[PDB]
Design a binder for this molecule. Structure first.
Ligand SMILES: O=C1N=NC(=O)c2cc(OCC3CC3)ccc21
Lengths: 194, 198
């Protein structure tokens, strides 16, 4: 389990509220405020989910072998409604659960501002919005298209050797779509307001 | 962590191994199959050695074994499919996003049968242009299960007031289970591919 995690008293799930002004809080706050400096942060919580982390690290080791190099991982944003937060904290991201123009997967934004739209981070009855900071195994990617259920093949002559993810634009990506469980680890939950 | 009876794959991550009749491994799968499908004949039985699917599956099994209270979480079940799906299942396993609607739906997931006779239906194991039918024998993490419902995209909660604490799978009938539905990747390991004909 990672260094920066705090002790869980032999439990396998904890949401840990970060201390404002310490290094970890400042790093995550800066990634958000790059594009969302007009929003008010109520809190940032570290997601310590041992089972999700295990399953994700296994996928990461496998993708590092398959792709014959590292650099398979990116930090991305995911806005969601308050009713989905408990599910994501416990079970992560489920493609089976908005527009799906680049395929039937889970969508992650490069910019917090994109995930901050009310259609994604729906304001709850008290006006609070929720956005995850997500470790995503984007790996080797191609342009997506409507109706994909998995990424395309890297060569139609080996139809089972797939891209790891798809994007809106391969030269200047602003979103990524992954199509498999455990390709995304929800690392921080930001609670914020307009 | 690959099983010690697998054949050497020489740094490769995937191998299909043809089993020999007379070996206990071939004969127990043949018996499991013929118990309900004695009218069909087996062409061959291949052991699926997929290092990546095995690792992800064994991680999910250890997690369910920890979470559940000394349960037998794992059953050996059947899955009939078309020849066009065999290369994908062999490499990537069972994808709920590719699943057909079942004639009796207990949820939107991947279906597994207790009896080979059910998977032997032409609806599931579609005969290819040479008349070969294909059925996987599958390690499935059924865990703790309940009767499913056609609307499900995940197993239901055990308790409505704790919506995130889920059953592991659903069935058609908890007293006499004949099918299981799983809603997550890496909850099933395709262990053997049976090729068979009328
Ligand atoms: O942050 C997000 N949370 N949920 C989404 O569905 C989502 C979707 C998304 O791109 C969808 C548009 C059609 C290409 C971007 C971000 C998010």
């Amino acid at each position: 389990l990672p260094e920066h995690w705090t002790d869980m008293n032999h439990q396998l799930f904890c949401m840990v509220q970060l201390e404002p002004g310490q290094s970890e809080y400042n790093t995550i706050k800066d990634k958000f405020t790059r594009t969302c400096s007009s929003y008010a942060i109520e809190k940032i919580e570290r997601i310590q989910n041992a089972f999700l982390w295990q399953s994700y690290q296994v996928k990461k080791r496998q993708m590092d072998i398959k792709n014959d190099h590292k650099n398979n991982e990116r930090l991305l944003f995911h806005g969601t409604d308050a009713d989905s937060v408990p599910y994501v904290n416990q079970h992560g991201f489920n493609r089976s659960c908005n527009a799906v123009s680049y395929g039937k997967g889970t969508y992650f934004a490069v910019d917090a501002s994109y995930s901050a739209k009310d259609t994604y981070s729906k304001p709850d009855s008290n006006g609070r919005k929720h956005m995850y900071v997500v470790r995503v195994l984007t790996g080797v990617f191609t342009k997506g298209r409507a109706g994909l259920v998995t990424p395309p093949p890297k060569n139609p002559h080996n139809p089972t050797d797939l891209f790891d993810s798809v994007t809106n634009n391969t030269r200047s990506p602003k979103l990524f779509v992954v199509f498999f469980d455990n390709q995304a680890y929800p690392e921080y939950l930001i609670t914020f307001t307009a």
